[PDB]
Symmetry: D2
């Protein structure tokens, strides 16, 4: 989409694992000045 | 059925990457029925 | 290496999480697909 | 310190995917630094 993409994840543990990865990538995005 | 959750993802490359991982895990789920 | 590439992972939980993803990718390739 | 493990990965694009995910998680690593 123009502001984000969506993905449907089956299962709470699985979702929490993918959210940890996604938040970490967003932390990586912040490293550039 | 199972509980599903929405992962909101920034960037097309990042989306394609997560979709690849999620599809592989779903094919693993499919083994058992 | 010529048969695989290796990555050092810090922490048991982190390793287990990546191993599950990696094995799922391999199972998808082996079942072709 | 921590305990370290080795992830064995097939394919160089798959290796670079895991490398990137791991590097992002490593921005979280610290003793309250």
């Amino acid at each position: 989409g123009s502001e984000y993409f969506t993905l449907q994840i089956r299962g709470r543990e699985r979702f929490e694992m993918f959210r940890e990865l996604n938040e970490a990538l967003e932390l990586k995005d912040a490293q550039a000045g």
